[PDB]
Structure formats: structure tokens, C-alpha cells
Amino acid sequence: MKLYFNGGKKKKIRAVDFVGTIAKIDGVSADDIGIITIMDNASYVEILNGKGPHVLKVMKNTTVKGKQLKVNKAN
RNA sequence: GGCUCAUCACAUCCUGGGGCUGGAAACGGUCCCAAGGGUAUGGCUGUUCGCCAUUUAAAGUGGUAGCUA
Helix, strand or coil: EEEECCCHHHHHHHHHHHHHHCCEECCEEEEEEEEEECCCCEEEEEECCCCHHHHHHHHCCCCCCCCCCCCCCCC
16 A cells, blocks of 8 residues: 655655665565655655555654654555 | 745854953954844665765754646
């Protein structure tokens, strides 16, 4: 599923900061990450293989680029 | 898909005038009175907490949609 993050170019977030921060979770591989779309204040990042909800309910409180952020289903 | 949003918060930094005073000078101190302002733009192998580059007088952290090639 597509996830929203209140982070983007203006918080100096990049596609990698996600890719790196996510893969390092027992249960998730880098192949599970679909398209990532950085924007001004929001990033879209797609999860594959139904591993969406899990990631989501784990990202809720994890330092990405050293800054926990709003995450949840895109919409 | 191009340019245009903030108000705040704790910071932090840049820019005066005037009496007196230190000092051989260069440069300072002190007291009185200020008025404003900056903290930005862009790069980097799609395994994160950075790195780098300019140009800022002054280069940080946090809270939430319009005019047109």
C-alpha cells in the first residue's frame, strides 16, 4: 500500500533515507519497497507484498534521517 | 508539472548613534538611547541519523491549497 510521510525535500529527506531506514527491519527486504516519490513536505512510498500495514505500524516511531514523522496510508 | 503560503516557539548571528574611557597605534571597553534584519539555493547509487558546493553582512531545530510553458 502507498504510505504518506510528512517529510520531503524541505526536511532534506531523500529516497535513500527511506530505503535504508526501512530495509533494516527484521521482516522486510529492500525488494518490498516500490516507488518512492519525494516532494516538498510529503513523501509517497509504496510497500509491496502486503507488508504494508506491518511497516506502517512500526514506522510510527522510528528515526528516519534522525527525525520521527507522521506516517500513514496515503489519503 | 513551473513560480506563490506561513504565524509561533527556544535559540543564534549580522548591521547603529552619543558621552566617557584603555591603548604608541592597530583595535578595544563601559554607560545611555536604538531601529531593523539573516538562518537560504542546488548537487550527490533507491540500505537512513550525513557529505559537498556556491553565493548570506548574518547559513537552526521543532509544531500545520493558485497565476501559467
